[PDB]
Structure formats: C-alpha cells, structure tokens
Structure 1
C-alpha cells in the first residue's frame, strides 16, 4: 500500500486517520538552480525520497510536496538572480503551510512532520506553523503537534561527516549543489546528474554581511557553493541510511504509537 496520500482514496485516508495516531509528512522544497551538473527539482526530490523511506518504516503517510520555496539567498543557494530558480514570496509560502495545517486538522489529523529540503524555507515554515496553531487555538484545538526539520541536520556523526568532507565540514549553507546533494541524487536519480559537468571550484567564501541587490560576482559562476567532484553513489547510500534511520527514530520518539 502506497505511503503517499495523493495515491490513496479518501476512504483509505479517512480510515488511516481514524486509527488515532496517524503521522503525516510534508516535504517542502524549491525549484532552484543546482549548477551545471544537476537538475533544478533536487530540493523537492530529496526530502520526498527521505519521507517515503521514513514513512515506509514507521507507518506514516506523505503529502504532496511543496514544489516552490522561498527566494534563493546568495550564501545558501547562489542567489535569486539565476535563471530557472522560481521562488515564492514569504507570505505565499507561509500561507500555503498555514492552509495545509488548517485542512489536516479539519480531517482529524494531529501529527505533522514538515521536512524541509531548501535551506531558505525554514523561517517561513516556522511562521506558517505559528499562525496555523494560533487559529487552531481559536477553534479550541490544542492537541495538534508539529515536528519541523531539515533532513541534513540529522547527519551529525563525526565519522560520517569525515567520509563526506575529508577536507572539513563547511556548513549546510555552503552545501548547495555540492557533495551532499549530488551524492544523494547519484544514489536516487542518477539520470538527473552528470558528474562530468561539475565545475571544480573552491568553496565559496563571503564576508560577514550581505548585500542587496544580490551581486552575481560574489557567487561562483556555475551557481554551486561547493564542488561535487567527489560525490558518489556510495556516499549517497550512506547519507540516505543515516537520515532515514535518524528521522524515523526522532518521529517515533515525538509521535509514539
């Protein structure tokens, strides 16, 4: 039986919610440039694949993912001046999250995991949750609980980090189109990555401030913030298992049967 809500009939869904401890998961991505070597829907594909695997293990369901996220920022996504990147205003993203939570509560659902795949989305997701929970309180609903996470934060093991980044970890922001995302894509969707097109530039560095309008000269030309030269399917498999296991465990802890 599919773990995707979109692939269920309303009766199947109703039955699953009626069971009492149903966990729903919502992937939140973006359509964003990911360099010369990878496609632009990475931030949707990756959290969705992680949700799927986690859902399979814990008996959860996955909602249709958010395909468009917040504006790419230079220091975490290259910047919103790139072609292809198609970004929402903060109010739009926040409102989308708010509307979905309201609707899930209407269904009787009370457990939601928001899995972020695009660095910049976080605070707008946070505001959507706050506004939704506020509204639920107005309606006398106080037992709706939300867990929000970015899947990469579960990769904490020093040994794993060293396997992925032998020259040192440079932060999840500078990991845009680099070893982590590319390794995952190589493991899950190899046809959408062409490692031969990777441009092997040094990791992007920035001063301790930001400038707007975004100045394109300050982003590496290919749009990546770090090189995926050493990306590998094997690295992807390792990332995937670590994230899936860690998130599954976290969800079980927060949403026990």
Structure 2
C-alpha cells in the first residue's frame, strides 16, 4: 500500500489520521540548475526518495512535494541568474508551507516532518511554520508538532565523510551538483545523470561577503560548486542508507508510537 498521500483515497487517508499517531512528511525542493551532468529537479527527487524510504520503514505518509523553492544564492547554488532555475519569492514559499500546515491541522494531523532538499529554502520554511503555529494557537491548538531538517545534515559519520570527501568535508553549501547529490542520483535515477559531462574544476571559493547584483564570474562556468568526478552509485547507496536510517530513528524519537 502506497506511502504517498496523493496515491491514497480520502477514506484511506482519513483512516490513517484517525489511528492517532500518524506522521506526515513533506519534501521541499526546487527547480535549479545542477551543472552539465545532471537534470534540474534533483532537489525534489532526492528528498522525495528519502521520504519514501523513511515512510516505508516507520509507517508514515508522504505529501506531494514542493517543486519550486527559494532563489538560488551564489555560495550554495551558483546564483539565480542561471537559465532553467525557477524560483519563488520568499513570501510565496512561506505562504505555501503555512497553508499546507493549516490544512493538515484541519484534517486532525498533528505530526509533520518537513524534509528540505534545497539549501536556500530553510528560513522561509521556518517562517511558514511559525506563522501556521501562530494561527493554530489562536484556536487553542498547541499540540501540532513539526520536525524540520535538511536530509544531508544526517550524514555525520567520520567513516562515511572520509569516503565522500577523502580530501576534507567541503561544507553542505559547496555541495551543489557535487559528489553527494550526484552519487545519490547515480544510485536512484542513473538515466538522469551523465558522469562524462562533469566539468572537473577546483571547489568554488568565495570572499567573506556577498554582492548583489550577483557577479556571474564568481561562479564556476558549469554552475556546480564542487566536482562530481568521483561520484559513484556505491557512494549513493551508502548515503541513502545513512540518511534513511538516521532520519527514521530521529522521527521515531520525536514522534513515538
């Protein structure tokens, strides 16, 4: 039986919420350039795939994902000046999260996991949550609980980190279109990756400040912030298992049966 709310009937959904401890998960992504070697829906595909696996394991349900995210920033995504990247204004993203929470609460749901897959979304997700919880408190509702996370933050194991970043962990911002996402993509959606098109450049470096309008010259030409040359299906499986396991455990701790 599907773990995707979209694939269930309203009766099936109603029954699952009626059970009393139902956990819902919402993938939050983006449509964003991911270099010469990968497609642009990565940030939707990856958190959605992780939510699916986590849900199967813990008996949770997964909502339709947010397909468009906040504006790409040079230091974490190359910059919003690239073609293809299609971004929302902050208020729009915030409002979407807020509306969704309001509705889940109307259903009787009280447990939500927001799984971010696009670096720049985080603070707008946070504001959406706050505004929704504020409204719930107006109606005397104080038992709606949210867990928010970016799936990569769960990859902390030194042993795993050394494999991926043998030469040093580059930070999750510089991990745009690099070894981490590319490996996952090779494991999950190999037809959407062409490792031979990877432009091997040295990891992007930036000064300690930001400039607007964004200066395109400061982003590597391909749009990637680090090279995915050494990405592998094997690395992807390793990441997948570590993320899925860690997130499941975290959700079980925060939302016990």
Give me the TM-score of the superposition, normalised by structure 1: 1.00
CA distance in 2, matches of 1:139, 1:9: 28
Alpha-carbon separation, structure 1, partners of 2:153 and 2:139: 34
Q: CA deviation at 1:29?
A: 0.1
- SS of the residue corresponding to residue 147 of structure 1 reads strand
* CA offset digits 1:90-114 (Å, max 9, x no partner): 0000000000000000000000000
Runs of 4+ in 1 over 4 A off after TM superposition: none
CA distance in 2, matches of 1:235, 1:156: 14
1:220 shift after superposition = 0.1
Partner residue, 1:159: 159
Q: Give deviations 1:125-150, integer Å, cap 9, x for gaps.
A: 00000000000000111000000000
Output one character per residue of 1:187-235: Cα deviation in whole Å (capped at 9) or x when no partner.
0000000000000000000000000000000000000000000000000
Alpha-carbon distance, 1:162 to partner: 0.2
Distance 1:174 1:138 in 2: 41
SS of 2:203's equivalent in the other structure is coil
Cα deviations by residue, 1:8-41 (Å, 9 ceiling, x for unpaired) = 0000000000000000000000000000000000
Distance 1:40 1:221 in 2: 16
Q: Secondary structure at the match of 2:112?
A: strand
Report the Cα distance in structure 1 between the residues aligned to 2:214 and 2:66, rounded to whole angstroms: 25
Q: Deviations over 1:70-120 (max 9, x none)?
A: 000000000000000000000000000000000000000000000000000
Whole-Å separation in 2 of the counterparts to 1:235 and 1:42: 17
Cα distance in 2 for partners of 1:70, 1:139 equals: 30
In structure 1, distance between residues paired with 2:189 and 2:103: 32
CA distance, structure 1, for counterparts of residue 99 and residue 241 of structure 2: 32
1-structure distance, mates of 2:193, 2:215: 28
SS of alignment partner, residue 191 of structure 1: helix
Tell me by how many angstroms 1:48 deviates: 0.1
1:220 aligns with 2:220: yes
Question: What are structure 2's unaligned runs of at least 5 residues?
Answer: none
**2 CA distance for matches of 1:247 and 1:66?**
19
- Residue 163 of structure 1 deviates from its aligned partner by 0.6
Q: Secondary structure at the match of 2:234?
A: helix
Residue 40 (structure 2) aligns with: 40
CA distance in structure 2 between the aligned counterparts of 1:79 and 1:140, rounded to whole angstroms? 42
CA distance in 2, matches of 1:75, 1:139: 41
Query: 3-state DSSP class of the match of 1:112?
Result: strand
In structure 2, C-alpha distance between the alignment counterparts of 1:172 and 1:160, rounded to whole Å: 15
CA distance, structure 2, for counterparts of residue 201 and residue 115 of structure 1 = 30
Within the alignment, does 1:204 sit opposite 2:204 as a pair? yes
How many residue pairs get aligned? The number is 257
Q: C-alpha distance in 2, partners of 1:195/1:171?
A: 22
Question: Structure 1 stretches of 5 or more lacking a match?
Answer: none
